[PDB]
Each structure stands twice: as structure tokens, then as C-alpha cells.
């Protein structure tokens, strides 16, 4: 689960080569499907995400 | 010599020990309102590209 009421199953443990590889040489380790935001409206795990990025590559920590 | 009633009161006075109002300040708060997040200054790029 996240801290936003997303909670789900693990269905698939994917490869590590499988997975899609950023242009960064990343690769990411869950793999969250778009739809559960339409009708749930978690806005607050899309700001999560961009400010949990901001805070790793700056060394920051955001409220 | 015995006590009788005597006449009616005219009036009652009601007395009680009250102060004032001071001036409306109206200072709510230390520091004041919800400050914003913000932007540390320079920051720089901590990440670059291969090649």
C-alpha cells in the first residue's frame, strides 16, 4: 500500500531485464497501474512521487 | 418596645466590582499564517548524462 489508500496485491515478481530501463540507466522496482487514479482521485500520490524525486536528486526533505 | 415595620424601601441599589475593555489589537499570531515551502537558492543539477 502507499499513503494514499492504494492498496494491491503483488501479483508479478518481473525480471530485472525486463523491465523498461529510463535513459538514465534506471530501472524501477514497482510497477503501479495508471488506472486507479481516475476514480479515485489520489492527487496526492502524483505530488508524492515528484516531490520524493526532487528530494532524492537534491538531498533534501520535503513536508 | 417590641420591632414593627417600617416604611417600604424607596429603591435598591445592586452593587458588583467591574473592569474595562483595552483597544482591538487583534494580534493572532507569533509568526503569523501558514509560510510557504520554497525554492533552496542555486540548487545545481546533482545528475548528468552518459557520454
Given at each position: 500500500a502507499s499513503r494514499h489508500g492504494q492498496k494491491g496485491?503483488?501479483?508479478?515478481?518481473?525480471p530485472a531485464e525486463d523491465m523498461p530501463f529510463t535513459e538514465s540507466g534506471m530501472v524501477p522496482d514497482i510497477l503501479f497501474n495508471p488506472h486507479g487514479f481516475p476514480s479515485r482521485m489520489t492527487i496526492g500520490m502524483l505530488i508524492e512521487s515528484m516531490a520524493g524525486k526532487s528530494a532524492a536528486l537534491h538531498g533534501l526533505c520535503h513536508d | 418596645g417590641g420591632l414593627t415595620c417600617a416604611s417600604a424601601p424607596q429603591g435598591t441599589l445592586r452593587?458588583?466590582?467591574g473592569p474595562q475593555q483595552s483597544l482591538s489589537g487583534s494580534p493572532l499570531q507569533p509568526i503569523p499564517a501558514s509560510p510557504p515551502p520554497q525554492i533552496?537558492?542555486?540548487?545545481?543539477?546533482?545528475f548528468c548524462a552518459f557520454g
Open positions: 496485491i503483488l501479483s508479478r515478481l518481473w | 452593587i458588583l466590582e533552496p537558492p542555486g540548487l545545481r543539477p546533482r
